[PDB]
Protein backbone atom coordinates (compact mmCIF):
# COMPACT_ATOMS: atom_id res chain seq x y z
CA UNK A 1 0.00 0.00 0.00
CA UNK A 2 0.92 3.69 -0.23
CA UNK A 3 0.19 7.03 1.45
CA UNK A 4 -2.42 9.60 0.39
CA UNK A 5 -2.96 13.14 1.66
CA UNK A 6 -6.45 14.42 2.50
CA UNK A 7 -6.83 18.20 2.39
CA UNK A 8 -10.00 19.27 4.17
CA UNK A 9 -9.81 16.96 7.17
CA UNK A 10 -11.03 17.62 10.74
CA UNK A 11 -7.86 18.03 12.80
CA UNK A 12 -7.21 19.68 16.16
CA UNK A 13 -4.08 20.99 17.85
CA UNK A 14 -4.13 22.73 21.23
CA UNK A 15 -2.36 26.00 20.45
CA UNK A 16 -2.70 29.54 21.78
CA UNK A 17 -3.19 32.56 19.52
CA UNK A 18 -4.26 36.14 20.12
CA UNK A 19 -8.02 36.65 19.82
CA UNK A 20 -9.80 39.88 18.88
CA UNK A 21 -12.63 41.40 20.88
CA UNK A 22 -16.20 41.73 19.62
CA UNK A 23 -18.65 44.26 21.04
CA UNK A 24 -22.36 43.61 20.67
CA UNK A 25 -24.07 45.92 18.18
CA UNK A 26 -26.64 47.10 20.73
CA UNK A 27 -23.89 47.53 23.34
CA UNK A 28 -22.35 50.53 21.53
CA UNK A 29 -24.89 51.59 18.90
CA UNK A 30 -27.80 52.21 21.28
CA UNK A 31 -26.62 54.68 23.94
CA UNK A 32 -23.10 54.03 25.28
CA UNK A 33 -20.73 56.91 24.49
CA UNK A 34 -17.28 57.32 26.07
CA UNK A 35 -17.30 54.12 28.13
CA UNK A 36 -14.23 51.94 28.54
CA UNK A 37 -15.89 48.55 28.08
CA UNK A 38 -16.58 49.22 24.38
CA UNK A 39 -14.10 50.37 21.73
CA UNK A 40 -13.33 49.85 18.03
CA UNK A 41 -13.77 46.07 18.39
CA UNK A 42 -15.43 44.33 15.44
CA UNK A 43 -19.19 43.83 15.96
CA UNK A 44 -20.17 40.18 16.17
CA UNK A 45 -22.02 38.30 13.46
CA UNK A 46 -25.83 38.43 13.78
CA UNK A 47 -25.94 34.70 14.61
CA UNK A 48 -22.88 32.60 15.51
CA UNK A 49 -21.89 29.64 13.35
CA UNK A 50 -22.70 27.24 16.18
CA UNK A 51 -22.36 23.71 14.80
CA UNK A 52 -23.04 20.74 17.08
CA UNK A 53 -20.54 17.89 16.91
CA UNK A 54 -21.24 14.21 17.57
CA UNK A 55 -19.32 11.34 19.17
CA UNK A 56 -16.38 13.60 20.07
CA UNK A 57 -14.71 13.93 23.48
CA UNK A 58 -12.16 16.70 24.01
CA UNK A 59 -10.07 17.31 27.12
CA UNK A 60 -10.65 20.63 28.88
CA UNK A 61 -8.57 22.31 31.58
CA UNK A 62 -9.48 25.81 32.74
CA UNK A 63 -6.56 25.93 35.19
CA UNK A 64 -4.15 25.59 32.24
CA UNK A 65 -6.26 27.71 29.88
CA UNK A 66 -4.94 30.74 28.02
CA UNK A 67 -8.12 32.69 27.24
CA UNK A 68 -8.37 33.86 30.85
CA UNK A 69 -4.87 35.37 30.80
CA UNK A 70 -5.52 36.92 27.39
CA UNK A 71 -8.75 38.56 28.53
CA UNK A 72 -7.19 39.76 31.78
CA UNK A 73 -4.39 41.42 29.79
CA UNK A 74 -6.90 42.98 27.40
CA UNK A 75 -8.89 44.36 30.34
CA UNK A 76 -5.70 45.76 31.90
CA UNK A 77 -4.66 47.51 28.68
CA UNK A 78 -8.20 48.79 28.07
CA UNK A 79 -8.47 50.20 31.60
CA UNK A 80 -5.10 51.93 31.28
CA UNK A 81 -6.04 53.37 27.87
CA UNK A 82 -9.31 54.67 29.32
CA UNK A 83 -7.49 56.29 32.25
CA UNK A 84 -4.71 57.85 30.14
CA UNK A 85 -6.55 60.90 28.67
CA UNK A 86 -7.71 62.09 32.11
CA UNK A 87 -5.63 64.64 33.99
CA UNK A 88 -3.31 63.53 36.79
CA UNK A 89 -3.62 64.48 40.46
CA UNK A 90 0.10 64.95 41.15
CA UNK A 91 -0.19 68.55 42.51
CA UNK A 92 -2.82 67.36 45.01
CA UNK A 93 -0.18 65.54 47.09
CA UNK A 94 0.23 68.06 49.92
CA UNK A 95 -0.39 68.36 53.65
CA UNK A 96 -4.09 68.65 54.52
CA UNK A 97 -5.67 70.00 57.72
CA UNK A 98 -8.58 67.66 58.49
CA UNK A 99 -11.44 67.66 60.98
CA UNK A 100 -14.02 64.89 61.13
CA UNK A 101 -17.62 65.86 60.42
CA UNK A 102 -20.21 65.54 63.20
CA UNK A 103 -23.33 66.60 61.28
CA UNK A 104 -24.89 63.14 61.57
CA UNK A 105 -23.98 59.73 63.00
CA UNK A 106 -25.45 56.48 61.68
CA UNK A 107 -21.21 53.15 62.88
CA UNK A 108 -19.53 56.56 62.77
CA UNK A 109 -19.52 58.56 59.55
CA UNK A 110 -15.68 58.50 59.39
CA UNK A 111 -15.62 61.33 56.82
CA UNK A 112 -13.06 64.12 57.06
CA UNK A 113 -13.42 67.72 55.90
CA UNK A 114 -9.89 68.73 54.92
CA UNK A 115 -8.50 72.14 53.98
CA UNK A 116 -5.57 72.47 51.58
CA UNK A 117 -3.79 75.70 50.64
CA UNK A 118 -3.75 75.61 46.83
CA UNK A 119 -2.59 79.10 45.87
CA UNK A 120 -7.56 77.46 51.85
CA UNK A 121 -9.96 75.17 49.97
CA UNK A 122 -12.15 72.53 51.62
CA UNK A 123 -12.93 69.01 50.44
CA UNK A 124 -14.48 65.83 51.83
CA UNK A 125 -12.68 62.49 52.05
CA UNK A 126 -13.10 59.08 53.66
CA UNK A 127 -11.06 57.66 56.53
CA UNK A 128 -9.59 54.77 54.52
CA UNK A 129 -8.62 57.20 51.75
CA UNK A 130 -6.44 59.52 53.86
CA UNK A 131 -3.82 58.69 56.51
CA UNK A 132 -2.65 60.95 59.32
CA UNK A 133 0.96 62.17 59.23
CA UNK A 134 2.94 62.88 62.39
CA UNK A 135 -4.03 66.73 62.84
CA UNK A 136 -2.18 66.79 59.53
CA UNK A 137 -3.26 64.22 56.94
CA UNK A 138 -2.00 63.03 53.56
CA UNK A 139 -3.32 60.92 50.71
CA UNK A 140 -2.60 57.22 51.18
CA UNK A 141 -0.41 56.90 48.06
CA UNK A 142 0.66 60.29 46.63
CA UNK A 143 4.33 60.25 47.78
CA UNK A 144 5.30 57.09 45.81
CA UNK A 145 2.38 56.71 43.38
CA UNK A 146 1.34 58.44 40.16
CA UNK A 147 -2.19 59.00 41.42
CA UNK A 148 -4.87 59.70 38.81
CA UNK A 149 -8.57 60.56 38.70
CA UNK A 150 -11.08 59.11 36.25
CA UNK A 151 -12.59 61.28 33.55
CA UNK A 152 -15.95 62.76 34.63
CA UNK A 153 -17.77 61.72 31.44
CA UNK A 154 -16.75 58.05 31.40
CA UNK A 155 -18.69 55.54 33.49
CA UNK A 156 -17.88 52.08 34.85
CA UNK A 157 -20.40 49.40 33.92
CA UNK A 158 -20.18 45.84 32.56
CA UNK A 159 -20.80 45.46 28.83
CA UNK A 160 -20.95 42.12 26.98
CA UNK A 161 -17.72 41.24 25.17
CA UNK A 162 -17.36 38.28 22.81
CA UNK A 163 -14.14 36.57 21.77
CA UNK A 164 -13.88 35.27 18.21
CA UNK A 165 -10.95 33.14 17.14
CA UNK A 166 -9.21 34.41 13.99
CA UNK A 167 -9.36 32.57 10.70
CA UNK A 168 -7.79 29.13 10.97
CA UNK A 169 -8.80 28.57 14.60
CA UNK A 170 -11.89 27.46 16.50
CA UNK A 171 -13.38 27.68 19.99
CA UNK A 172 -14.30 24.28 21.39
CA UNK A 173 -17.19 24.69 23.82
CA UNK A 174 -18.21 22.10 26.42
CA UNK A 175 -22.02 22.10 26.42
CA UNK A 176 -22.23 19.53 29.24
CA UNK A 177 -24.35 20.96 32.05
CA UNK A 178 -22.64 18.63 34.56
CA UNK A 179 -19.02 19.63 33.93
CA UNK A 180 -16.53 20.47 36.69
CA UNK A 181 -14.02 21.76 34.13
CA UNK A 182 -11.24 19.17 33.87
CA UNK A 183 -10.58 16.11 31.76
CA UNK A 184 -12.87 14.78 29.04
CA UNK A 185 -16.09 16.54 28.07
CA UNK A 186 -18.78 14.26 26.56
CA UNK A 187 -20.49 16.90 24.38
CA UNK A 188 -18.14 19.26 22.52
CA UNK A 189 -19.59 21.89 20.21
CA UNK A 190 -17.58 24.29 18.06
CA UNK A 191 -18.00 28.05 17.70
CA UNK A 192 -16.29 31.03 16.11
CA UNK A 193 -17.49 33.65 18.63
CA UNK A 194 -18.06 32.99 22.33
CA UNK A 195 -21.06 33.98 24.41
CA UNK A 196 -21.42 37.31 26.19
CA UNK A 197 -18.69 38.03 28.75
CA UNK A 198 -19.15 41.01 31.04
CA UNK A 199 -15.94 42.31 32.67
CA UNK A 200 -16.99 42.75 36.30
CA UNK A 201 -14.68 43.36 39.26
CA UNK A 202 -15.71 41.55 42.44
CA UNK A 203 -14.22 39.51 45.28
CA UNK A 204 -15.80 36.67 47.29
CA UNK A 205 -18.85 37.09 45.03
CA UNK A 206 -19.62 37.03 41.31
CA UNK A 207 -21.97 39.80 40.20
CA UNK A 208 -23.73 39.82 36.81
CA UNK A 209 -22.42 36.25 36.67
CA UNK A 210 -23.60 33.55 34.30
CA UNK A 211 -25.94 31.16 36.09
CA UNK A 212 -25.14 27.47 35.69
CA UNK A 213 -27.83 25.03 34.60
CA UNK A 214 -28.62 21.76 36.42
CA UNK A 215 -27.37 21.92 40.05
CA UNK A 216 -24.77 24.05 41.82
CA UNK A 217 -21.27 23.25 40.55
CA UNK A 218 -17.98 23.03 42.47
CA UNK A 219 -14.75 23.52 40.53
CA UNK A 220 -11.06 23.36 41.49
CA UNK A 221 -7.78 22.08 40.09
CA UNK A 222 -7.25 20.18 43.36
CA UNK A 223 -9.98 19.82 46.01
CA UNK A 224 -7.44 18.05 48.23
CA UNK A 225 -4.84 20.82 48.01
CA UNK A 226 -5.48 23.74 50.35
CA UNK A 227 -3.79 26.40 48.21
CA UNK A 228 -5.96 26.09 45.10
CA UNK A 229 -9.11 28.21 45.06
CA UNK A 230 -12.62 26.81 44.65
CA UNK A 231 -15.27 28.23 42.33
CA UNK A 232 -18.93 27.72 43.26
CA UNK A 233 -21.58 28.30 40.60
CA UNK A 234 -25.16 28.55 41.83
CA UNK A 235 -28.10 27.42 39.72
CA UNK A 236 -30.44 30.12 41.08
CA UNK A 237 -29.08 33.70 41.03
CA UNK A 238 -29.39 35.53 44.35
CA UNK A 239 -30.67 39.09 44.38
CA UNK A 240 -28.58 41.73 46.12
CA UNK A 241 -29.80 45.32 46.55
CA UNK A 242 -27.06 47.69 47.70
CA UNK A 243 -27.35 51.44 48.19
CA UNK A 244 -25.28 54.29 49.58
CA UNK A 245 -27.68 56.57 51.53
CA UNK A 246 -25.99 59.88 50.76
CA UNK A 247 -25.87 62.55 48.07
CA UNK A 248 -22.82 64.65 47.22
CA UNK A 249 -21.87 67.56 44.97
CA UNK A 250 -18.78 68.07 42.82
CA UNK A 251 -16.57 71.14 43.20
CA UNK A 252 -14.34 71.99 40.23
CA UNK A 253 -10.99 73.08 41.67
CA UNK A 254 -8.34 73.85 39.06
CA UNK A 255 -4.85 72.48 39.68
CA UNK A 256 -6.63 70.23 34.98
CA UNK A 257 -10.12 70.45 36.49
CA UNK A 258 -9.95 68.43 39.71
CA UNK A 259 -13.34 67.28 41.04
CA UNK A 260 -13.71 67.23 44.82
CA UNK A 261 -16.55 65.88 46.94
CA UNK A 262 -18.82 68.46 48.55
CA UNK A 263 -21.03 68.45 51.62
CA UNK A 264 -23.76 65.82 51.82
CA UNK A 265 -27.42 66.73 51.36
CA UNK A 266 -29.05 66.22 54.75
CA UNK A 267 -28.36 62.95 56.53
CA UNK A 268 -25.15 60.92 56.29
CA UNK A 269 -25.18 57.13 56.66
CA UNK A 270 -22.82 54.30 55.78
CA UNK A 271 -23.72 52.20 52.76
CA UNK A 272 -25.83 49.07 53.11
CA UNK A 273 -26.58 46.00 51.01
CA UNK A 274 -29.59 43.70 51.40
CA UNK A 275 -29.92 39.98 50.62
CA UNK A 276 -32.91 37.75 51.36
CA UNK A 277 -32.22 35.29 54.17
CA UNK A 278 -34.20 32.30 52.88
CA UNK A 279 -32.61 32.28 49.42
CA UNK A 280 -29.16 32.56 50.98
CA UNK A 281 -29.92 29.64 53.30
CA UNK A 282 -31.20 27.48 50.43
CA UNK A 283 -28.19 28.27 48.23
CA UNK A 284 -25.83 27.51 51.12
CA UNK A 285 -27.68 24.22 51.59
CA UNK A 286 -27.10 23.26 47.97
CA UNK A 287 -23.45 24.32 48.21
CA UNK A 288 -22.79 22.29 51.36
CA UNK A 289 -24.62 19.32 49.83
CA UNK A 290 -22.33 19.38 46.80
CA UNK A 291 -19.25 19.90 48.98
CA UNK A 292 -20.27 16.92 51.12
CA UNK A 293 -20.68 14.92 47.91
CA UNK A 294 -17.08 15.83 47.09
CA UNK A 295 -16.15 15.13 50.74
CA UNK A 296 -18.42 12.36 52.01
CA UNK A 297 -21.65 12.51 53.98
CA UNK A 298 -19.91 12.15 57.36
CA UNK A 299 -17.83 15.27 56.69
CA UNK A 300 -18.75 18.41 58.62
CA UNK A 301 -18.87 21.69 56.68
CA UNK A 302 -18.23 24.92 58.57
CA UNK A 303 -18.04 28.52 57.39
CA UNK A 304 -16.28 31.62 58.65
CA UNK A 305 -15.69 35.21 57.61
CA UNK A 306 -12.52 36.52 55.97
CA UNK A 307 -9.09 35.75 57.49
CA UNK A 308 -7.60 39.18 56.72
CA UNK A 309 -5.13 40.59 54.23
CA UNK A 310 -5.25 43.96 52.51
CA UNK A 311 -8.81 45.25 52.28
CA UNK A 312 -9.91 44.45 48.70
CA UNK A 313 -10.05 40.70 49.43
CA UNK A 314 -11.33 40.55 53.04
CA UNK A 315 -14.44 42.47 52.00
CA UNK A 316 -16.40 42.25 48.74
CA UNK A 317 -15.09 44.92 46.38
CA UNK A 318 -17.37 46.10 43.60
CA UNK A 319 -18.20 49.22 41.59
CA UNK A 320 -21.79 50.49 41.52
CA UNK A 321 -22.82 53.48 39.42
CA UNK A 322 -19.23 54.72 39.42
CA UNK A 323 -18.61 54.37 43.17
CA UNK A 324 -16.35 51.62 44.52
CA UNK A 325 -17.94 49.95 47.55
CA UNK A 326 -15.88 47.64 49.76
CA UNK A 327 -18.79 45.81 51.36
CA UNK A 328 -18.10 43.36 54.17
CA UNK A 329 -19.38 39.80 54.21
CA UNK A 330 -18.43 39.24 57.86
CA UNK A 331 -21.90 37.91 58.66
CA UNK A 332 -22.92 36.04 55.51
CA UNK A 333 -20.51 33.12 56.03
CA UNK A 334 -21.02 32.73 59.80
CA UNK A 335 -22.84 29.40 60.20
CA UNK A 336 -21.80 25.92 61.34
CA UNK A 337 -23.52 23.09 59.47
CA UNK A 338 -23.96 19.42 60.36
CA UNK A 339 -24.79 16.25 58.45
CA UNK A 340 -29.04 40.00 55.77
CA UNK A 341 -28.10 43.67 56.04
CA UNK A 342 -24.46 44.19 55.07
CA UNK A 343 -23.04 47.45 56.48
CA UNK A 344 -20.21 48.75 54.37
CA UNK A 345 -18.08 51.69 53.29
CA UNK A 346 -16.40 53.29 50.28
CA UNK A 347 -12.82 54.14 49.33
CA UNK A 348 -12.25 56.73 46.62
CA UNK A 349 -8.57 55.80 46.13
CA UNK A 350 -8.48 52.27 44.72
CA UNK A 351 -5.68 49.95 43.63
CA UNK A 352 -7.24 48.01 40.77
CA UNK A 353 -5.81 44.67 39.60
CA UNK A 354 -3.42 44.52 42.59
CA UNK A 355 -0.47 46.48 41.25
CA UNK A 356 1.66 49.18 42.86
CA UNK A 357 1.41 51.29 39.71
CA UNK A 358 -1.07 54.08 39.08
CA UNK A 359 -4.10 54.16 41.40
CA UNK A 360 -7.33 55.65 40.09
CA UNK A 361 -9.36 58.21 42.04
CA UNK A 362 -13.11 57.61 42.00
CA UNK A 363 -15.05 60.68 40.81
CA UNK A 364 -17.96 61.66 43.07
CA UNK A 365 -21.45 60.41 42.23
CA UNK A 366 -24.28 62.89 42.73
CA UNK A 367 -27.43 61.64 44.42
CA UNK A 368 -28.28 58.32 46.00
CA UNK A 369 -26.47 55.40 44.34
CA UNK A 370 -28.51 52.18 44.37
CA UNK A 371 -28.06 49.00 42.37
CA UNK A 372 -29.40 45.46 42.00
CA UNK A 373 -27.04 42.59 41.16
CA UNK A 374 -26.96 38.84 40.56
CA UNK A 375 -24.84 37.00 43.12
CA UNK A 376 -24.18 33.83 41.11
CA UNK A 377 -20.63 32.72 41.93
CA UNK A 378 -18.69 32.23 45.14
CA UNK A 379 -14.92 32.02 45.64
CA UNK A 380 -13.88 29.77 48.52
CA UNK A 381 -10.47 29.04 50.03
CA UNK A 382 -10.35 25.69 51.81
CA UNK A 383 -9.22 25.65 55.43
CA UNK A 384 -5.91 24.09 56.39
CA UNK A 385 -5.45 20.60 57.74
CA UNK A 386 -5.21 16.84 61.68
CA UNK A 387 -7.66 15.00 59.44
CA UNK A 388 -11.25 13.72 59.24
CA UNK A 389 -12.58 16.42 61.58
CA UNK A 390 -14.31 19.17 59.55
CA UNK A 391 -13.76 21.70 56.76
CA UNK A 392 -13.98 25.50 56.73
CA UNK A 393 -14.52 27.57 53.58
CA UNK A 394 -13.75 31.19 54.44
CA UNK A 395 -14.09 33.31 51.28
CA UNK A 396 -10.97 34.41 49.45
CA UNK A 397 -10.24 35.48 45.89
CA UNK A 398 -8.99 38.88 44.80
CA UNK A 399 -7.09 37.43 41.86
CA UNK A 400 -9.01 38.91 38.94
CA UNK A 401 -8.00 36.04 36.66
CA UNK A 402 -9.90 33.74 39.02
CA UNK A 403 -12.96 35.93 38.45
CA UNK A 404 -12.46 35.73 34.68
CA UNK A 405 -12.02 31.94 34.78
CA UNK A 406 -15.64 31.47 35.89
CA UNK A 407 -17.04 33.00 32.69
CA UNK A 408 -14.49 31.36 30.36
CA UNK A 409 -14.67 27.91 31.98
CA UNK A 410 -16.22 26.22 28.93
CA UNK A 411 -13.99 27.34 26.04
CA UNK A 412 -10.68 26.29 24.55
CA UNK A 413 -8.82 27.75 21.56
CA UNK A 414 -7.83 25.05 19.08
CA UNK A 415 -5.84 25.23 15.84
CA UNK A 416 -7.29 23.22 12.96
CA UNK A 417 -4.68 21.60 10.71
CA UNK A 418 -6.57 20.12 7.74
CA UNK A 419 -3.60 18.50 6.01
CA UNK A 420 -3.64 15.00 7.47
CA UNK A 421 -2.22 11.98 5.67
CA UNK A 422 -3.33 8.36 5.72
CA UNK A 423 -2.34 5.00 4.23
CA UNK A 424 -4.46 3.24 1.61
CA UNK A 425 -4.27 0.90 -1.38
CA UNK A 426 -3.84 3.54 -4.07
CA UNK A 427 -0.86 4.29 -6.31
CA UNK A 428 -0.48 7.24 -8.67
CA UNK A 429 0.06 6.19 -12.28
Amino acid at each position, epitope marked *: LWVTVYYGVPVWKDA*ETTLFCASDAKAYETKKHNVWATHACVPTDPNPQEIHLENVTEEFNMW*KN*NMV*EQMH*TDI*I*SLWDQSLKPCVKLTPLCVTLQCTNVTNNITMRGELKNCSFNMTKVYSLFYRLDVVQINKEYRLINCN*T*SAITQACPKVSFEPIPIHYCAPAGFAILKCKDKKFNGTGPCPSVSTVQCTHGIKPVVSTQLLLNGSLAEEEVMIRSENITN*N*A*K*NILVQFNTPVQINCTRPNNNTRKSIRIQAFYATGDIIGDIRQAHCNVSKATWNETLGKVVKQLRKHFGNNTIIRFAN*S*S*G*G*DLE*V*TTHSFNCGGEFFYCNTSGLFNSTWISITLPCRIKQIINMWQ*R*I*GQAMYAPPIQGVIRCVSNITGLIL*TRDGGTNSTTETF*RP*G*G*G*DM*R*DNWRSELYKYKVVKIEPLGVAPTRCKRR
Partner: nanobody
Amino acid sequence: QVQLQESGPGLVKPSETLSLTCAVSGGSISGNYWSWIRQSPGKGLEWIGHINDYSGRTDYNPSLKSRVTISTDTSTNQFFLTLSSVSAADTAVYYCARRDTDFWRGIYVFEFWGQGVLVTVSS
Protein backbone atom coordinates in the same frame (compact mmCIF):
# COMPACT_ATOMS: atom_id res chain seq x y z
CA GLN B 1 8.81 21.51 38.49
CA VAL B 2 10.51 24.73 37.37
CA GLN B 3 14.29 25.17 37.57
CA LEU B 4 16.05 28.54 37.66
CA GLN B 5 19.61 29.44 36.67
CA GLU B 6 20.84 33.01 37.14
CA SER B 7 24.07 34.39 35.72
CA GLY B 8 25.94 37.64 35.29
CA PRO B 9 29.16 39.47 36.11
CA GLY B 10 30.47 38.90 39.62
CA LEU B 11 32.38 42.19 39.77
CA VAL B 12 30.85 45.45 38.54
CA LYS B 13 32.37 48.92 38.77
CA PRO B 14 30.34 51.74 40.34
CA SER B 15 28.04 53.88 38.19
CA GLU B 16 27.22 51.77 35.16
CA THR B 17 24.58 49.28 34.05
CA LEU B 18 24.37 45.92 35.83
CA SER B 19 23.01 43.05 33.74
CA LEU B 20 21.63 39.75 35.05
CA THR B 21 20.16 36.92 32.98
CA CYS B 22 17.97 34.16 34.42
CA ALA B 23 16.99 31.08 32.41
CA VAL B 24 13.91 29.10 33.44
CA SER B 25 13.11 25.48 32.59
CA GLY B 26 9.78 23.70 32.91
CA GLY B 27 7.70 26.85 33.36
CA SER B 28 4.14 27.25 32.20
CA ILE B 29 3.50 28.18 28.57
CA SER B 30 1.98 31.55 29.50
CA GLY B 31 0.87 33.65 32.45
CA ASN B 32 4.12 33.32 34.40
CA TYR B 33 5.36 35.98 36.83
CA TRP B 34 9.16 36.13 36.80
CA SER B 35 10.27 38.25 39.75
CA TRP B 36 13.67 39.67 40.67
CA ILE B 37 14.55 39.99 44.37
CA ARG B 38 17.77 40.91 46.17
CA GLN B 39 19.25 40.86 49.66
CA SER B 40 21.92 43.36 50.66
CA PRO B 41 24.52 42.12 53.16
CA GLY B 42 23.72 43.11 56.72
CA LYS B 43 20.13 43.91 55.75
CA GLY B 44 16.77 42.29 55.07
CA LEU B 45 15.48 41.19 51.70
CA GLU B 46 13.65 43.58 49.39
CA TRP B 47 11.65 43.11 46.21
CA ILE B 48 13.01 44.58 42.98
CA GLY B 49 10.45 43.83 40.31
CA HIS B 50 8.42 41.36 38.33
CA ILE B 51 7.46 40.68 34.72
CA ASN B 52 4.39 39.00 33.22
CA ASP B 53 6.17 37.15 30.41
CA TYR B 54 2.88 36.92 28.48
CA SER B 55 1.48 40.46 28.67
CA GLY B 56 4.94 42.01 28.78
CA ARG B 57 3.91 44.74 31.22
CA THR B 58 6.48 45.25 33.96
CA ASP B 59 6.33 46.32 37.57
CA TYR B 60 9.09 47.63 39.82
CA ASN B 61 9.62 48.77 43.38
CA PRO B 62 8.61 52.43 43.81
CA SER B 63 12.04 53.36 45.20
CA LEU B 64 13.82 51.77 42.21
CA LYS B 65 11.42 52.67 39.39
CA SER B 66 13.97 55.04 37.81
CA ARG B 67 16.99 52.70 37.78
CA VAL B 68 15.70 49.24 36.78
CA THR B 69 14.35 47.64 33.61
CA ILE B 70 13.23 44.01 33.28
CA SER B 71 12.79 42.31 29.90
CA THR B 72 11.91 38.78 28.82
CA ASP B 73 12.30 36.61 25.72
CA THR B 74 9.98 33.65 25.23
CA SER B 75 11.76 31.93 22.32
CA THR B 76 14.95 31.32 24.30
CA ASN B 77 12.68 31.46 27.37
CA GLN B 78 14.82 33.67 29.62
CA PHE B 79 14.49 37.04 31.30
CA PHE B 80 16.95 39.86 31.91
CA LEU B 81 17.40 42.51 34.59
CA THR B 82 19.18 45.78 33.79
CA LEU B 83 19.89 47.98 36.83
CA SER B 84 21.46 51.16 35.48
CA SER B 85 23.29 53.81 37.52
CA VAL B 86 24.41 51.34 40.19
CA SER B 87 25.67 52.76 43.49
CA ALA B 88 27.87 51.50 46.33
CA ALA B 89 24.91 50.28 48.41
CA ASP B 90 23.52 48.01 45.66
CA THR B 91 25.98 45.17 46.30
CA ALA B 92 23.80 42.19 47.18
CA VAL B 93 22.85 38.60 46.51
CA TYR B 94 20.34 38.56 43.65
CA TYR B 95 17.70 35.87 43.16
CA CYS B 96 15.35 35.25 40.26
CA ALA B 97 12.15 33.62 41.49
CA ARG B 98 8.70 32.64 40.27
CA ARG B 99 5.61 33.77 42.17
CA ASP B 100 2.49 31.62 42.12
CA THR B 101 -1.03 32.39 40.90
CA ASP B 102 -2.98 30.75 43.74
CA PHE B 103 -3.38 33.93 45.84
CA TRP B 104 -4.16 32.12 49.10
CA ARG B 105 -5.88 34.81 51.17
CA GLY B 106 -4.00 37.91 50.04
CA ILE B 107 -0.50 36.52 49.41
CA TYR B 108 1.75 35.88 46.45
CA VAL B 109 4.73 33.67 47.31
CA PHE B 110 7.83 32.82 45.29
CA GLU B 111 7.98 29.02 45.45
CA PHE B 112 10.90 28.58 43.06
CA TRP B 113 14.11 30.52 43.76
CA GLY B 114 17.48 30.71 42.08
CA GLN B 115 20.74 29.68 43.69
CA GLY B 116 21.69 33.29 44.42
CA VAL B 117 24.23 35.24 42.37
CA LEU B 118 26.63 37.62 44.09
CA VAL B 119 26.95 41.17 42.77
CA THR B 120 29.65 43.35 44.35
CA VAL B 121 30.34 46.97 43.42
CA SER B 122 33.91 48.20 43.84
CA SER B 123 36.58 50.22 42.06
